Amino acid sequence: EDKLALGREIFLERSEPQCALCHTLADAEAVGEVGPNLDELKPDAERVNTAVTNGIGPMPANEILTDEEIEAVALYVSTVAGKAKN
Amino acid sequence: MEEDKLALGREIFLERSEPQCALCHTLADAEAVGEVGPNLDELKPDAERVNTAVTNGIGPMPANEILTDEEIEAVALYVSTVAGK
Amino acid sequence: EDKLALGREIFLERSEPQCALCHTLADAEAVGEVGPNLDELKPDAERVNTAVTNGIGPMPANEILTDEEIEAVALYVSTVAGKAKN
Amino acid sequence: MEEDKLALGREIFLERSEPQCALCHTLADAEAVGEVGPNLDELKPDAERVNTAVTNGIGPMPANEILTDEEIEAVALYVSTVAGK
Ligand code: HEC
Ligand code: HEC
Ligand code: HEC
Ligand code: HEC
């Protein structure tokens, strides 16, 4: 509910650069084309958290998000991938 | 197709759908230029093929939650009518 | 000069749907991804005019542009393809 | 790289260039998410490789007209410094 609104906001607004600009994710109405479609990947929380934290390939590692924000966007993505809002 | 049903189908394809079909798909009639999904002017699906994709989802396309059945029938008819013109 | 401003405006604003939404063309700062990069294709005036007039593949045929507007966007594209503004 | 030269390189990559490099290219440092051209965080070009592309154009990438040589050197240094971080 509220932990979802948070991840959504990180995915769309707080992240730098924003996840939504690089990634596709229907729940967020995000259609970024730079990296993989997250509705296709359907990653678990750990996989997201690791990717955001360390970076991977040409994806940059996080600098501005706190650890709890990284967890919240990891939880969010892993829960909503493949599905639309509510 | 009567002008009011076409107007209905356009509104669903462009705005009512969640996410909006036009966010992901191209369809010249609606001036939709989505890229993530297939170009519907290329696909030229029939009404049943559209109805099934929207109702059930397909691959990374999400299943509909917001539209009613009548609204799904409406957009299916719309897309199958105008795709490729 | 003025015949170029015209083609540019047709390419960006007057066309329905707009050429710029489907096509990439540097002079217009257009980065549409639906059809081919026109800076890559570098078509002659005839090839553009025919495509706009008749449509081709999933590209729709024109309905709203007058014949002189079709000529102007054909002239424009064929002159500027591969190059940036002035 | 001093903060003012980085600020210069960002401004050129994002706004001064014509068209804007960020319109076509991805570069995380600039929050650029262009798709038409290659991802520069993947390419990780050196300064000479950037200078040559911008000066001469390459494939469907147009040659620079607007930037001065100093401005081309600046953006080349910028991209080669930050590409991949
Ligand atoms: C471009 C400037 C991006 C930013 C902003 C975000 N992501 Fe990303 N991501 C991007 C690329 C090019 C890749 C592919 C990496 C590779 O070379 O394989 C990714 C990858 C991911 C993944 C999958 C990682 C894996 O284990 O395979 C995930 C789950 C992911 N990215 C999520 C994600 C999040 C939550 C972002 C906001 C903090 C984010 N990405 C931003 C490109 C870019
Ligand atoms: C991104 C979040 C999408 C939205 C929103 C809509 N569609 Fe979609 N669609 C999308 C993808 C990635 C695909 C490919 C599916 C696959 O893996 O093959 C599709 C596909 C379709 C199709 C073709 C289905 C088939 O039988 O092959 C149709 C007819 C279609 N989509 C229609 C459609 C409608 C009506 C939408 C709004 C209700 C809509 N799509 C939204 C991506 C996305
Ligand atoms: C999508 C909704 C588009 C609109 C709007 C415009 N174009 Fe297009 N164009 C599009 C596609 C998908 C294609 C490929 C056709 C194929 O199947 O091969 C094209 C093609 C062209 C071409 C090349 C034609 C050829 O001879 O190979 C040109 C020169 C071209 N289009 C120009 C053009 C102009 C001027 C437009 C505005 C009036 C325009 N296109 C709009 C997709 C779409
Ligand atoms: C679209 C109109 C572009 C703009 C604006 C810029 N670039 Fe670009 N770039 C573009 C394409 C399609 C390509 C691929 C070229 C090819 O055919 O291989 C490129 C390539 C580059 C490269 C790599 C060059 C190489 O040696 O392979 C670099 C380093 C590069 N571009 C940098 C760059 C800069 C600094 C820009 C602003 C001055 C810029 N590009 C704009 C497309 C477009």
Author numbering:
A (entry chain A), C (entry chain A): 29 to 114
B (entry chain C), D (entry chain C): 27 to 111
Paper passage:
In most cells, the detoxification of sulfite by oxidation to sulfate (Equation 1) is catalyzed by sulfite oxidizing enzymes (SOEs). Here, we have investigated an electron transfer complex involving the periplasmic SorT sulfite dehydrogenase from the α-Proteobacterium Sinorhizobium meliloti, which represents a structurally uncharacterized type of SOE, and its electron acceptor, the c-type cytochrome SorU. In S. meliloti the SorT sulfite dehydrogenase is part of a sulfite detoxification system that is induced in response to the degradation of sulfur containing substrates such as the organosulfonate taurine. Electrons derived from sulfite oxidation are passed on to the SorU cytochrome, and likely then to cytochrome oxidase, as S. meliloti is capable of sulfite respiration.
The structure of the SorU protein, both within the SorT/SorU complex and when crystallized in isolation, is predominantly α-helical with three major α-helices arranged to form a bundle that frames the heme-binding site (C47XXC50H, axial ligands: His 51 and Met 87). Unlike other known cytochromes c that can act as electron acceptors to SOEs, the electrostatic surface of SorU has an overall negative charge. Small (ca. 20 × 10 × 10 μ) crystals of SorU were grown in drops containing equal volumes (2 μL) of protein and reservoir solution (1.8 M tri-sodium citrate, pH 5.5, 0.1 M glycine), which were harvested and flash-cooled in liquid nitrogen without additional cryoprotection. The refined SorU model, from the SorT/SorU complex structure, was used as a search model to solve the SorU structure by molecular replacement using PHASER. Refinement was carried out with REFMAC5 and PHENIX and converged with residuals R= 0.192 and Rfree = 0.240.
